């Protein structure tokens, strides 16, 4: 199942973005985040398991992280031959030291997700290695290819003073990885990353996942599926999480708890956003028509009564939801504001 759709969008915003310099507040528009979020998404489903006689016994992604699975994974074809090999041949012109327009940030870190590869050019796990049980040594390699999709995206930032750029480190690459280690591995390291001017949205993804880990056992509210990959959650989801991790509010959402839940979904006419509102346990489907890249939207706001008040604003409207105007993106409690809802329809391991 190779979606070409998001191969063309994927081309076409690359064209348009190629020669934008990133400036100070430059941020990647709800369309392209979108375009974005289909390709990484369309690259699992087209090679979505392991074959049994290549297979991780620690039940590791390796479908998604190895050269064995990627090579002949068609999606991965597809794309690198699109527009006579186009977009390969720009792709390798790039590095993070010397990358100054959108399109090629956009480029260089979607196609290293898409090859399996860290920016250092290395593998982010070895074809030797996908059948290997030792899980500390398998973990570890995982959790450096996570940390450097976000650690250069910083560096990128601190370099041209960049407030906004964010793509996120998807789901599958976060295999054991803590999410309070990856945090304060960056963030302890490098003061510049901690200017109220740089990288705030990379800063919002870590910051909620140091606080909120991927299993919540009990604690648990939530949990999305896709492809076999889960993640739970207790608070309201952020688009920056939804976004960053590569899930959809179309995937397989179990609620735990009878807490109202409403799913965000898509814009409106009204300067607002339509949602749907959930209630009961077990499964909440949204039946709706996908919208399109110009119009979806994903994120959570979790209602309940035991939220903690220094969790409370993840679910606030206009942090929940990423602006569409990139200068008044939030992207902590100092900034977040929950105005605006008449504008808006229903249409019917760290652990907080």
């Given at each position: 199942d190779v979606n070409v759709a998001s191969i063309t969008a994927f081309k076409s915003m690359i064209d348009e973005t190629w020669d934008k310099k990133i400036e100070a507040n430059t941020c990647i528009s709800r369309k392209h985040r979108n375009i974005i979020h289909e390709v990484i998404r369309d690259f699992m489903k087209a090679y979505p398991k392991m074959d049994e006689n290549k297979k991780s016994p620690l039940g590791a992604p390796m479908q998604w992280l190895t050269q064995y699975y990627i090579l002949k994974n068609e999606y991965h074809k597809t794309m690198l031959a699109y527009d006579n090999g186009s977009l390969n041949t720009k792709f390798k012109t790039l590095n993070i030291y010397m990358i100054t327009n959108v399109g090629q940030y956009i480029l260089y870190i979607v196609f290293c997700i898409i090859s399996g590869k860290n920016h250092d050019g290395?593998?982010?796990?070895?074809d030797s290695e996908?059948?290997?049980?030792?899980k500390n040594f398998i973990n570890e390699r995982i959790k450096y290819a996570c940390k450097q999709i976000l650690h250069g995206q910083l560096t990128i930032a601190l370099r041209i003073r960049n407030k906004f750029m964010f793509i996120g480190s998807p789901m599958?690459?976060?295999?054991?990885?803590?999410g309070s280690q990856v945090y304060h591995d960056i963030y302890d390291r490098?003061?510049?990353?901690?200017?109220?001017?740089?990288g705030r949205l990379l800063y919002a993804f870590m910051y909620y996942l140091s606080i909120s880990g991927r299993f919540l056992n009990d604690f648990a509210l939530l949990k999305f599926t896709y492809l076999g990959e889960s993640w739970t959650f207790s608070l309201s989801v952020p688009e920056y999480i939804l976004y960053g991790l590569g899930?959809?509010?179309?995937?397989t959402i179990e609620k735990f708890s009878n807490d109202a839940i409403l799913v965000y979904i898509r814009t409106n006419n009204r300067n607002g956003y339509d949602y749907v509102e959930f209630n009961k346990k077990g499964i909440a489907k949204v039946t709706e028509d996908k919208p399109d890249n110009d119009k979806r939207i994903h994120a959570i706001r979790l209602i309940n009564d035991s939220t903690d008040v220094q969790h409370?604003?993840?679910?606030?409207r206009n942090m929940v939801i990423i602006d569409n105007e990139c200068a008044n993106i939030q992207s902590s409690a100092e900034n977040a504001t929950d105005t605006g809802h008449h504008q808006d329809s229903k249409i019917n391991t760290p652990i907080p």
């Open positions: 290395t593998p982010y796990i070895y996908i059948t290997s049980n030792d599958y690459l976060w295999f054991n990885v803590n490098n003061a510049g990353f901690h200017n109220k001017e740089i899930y959809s509010v179309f995937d409370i604003h993840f679910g606030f």
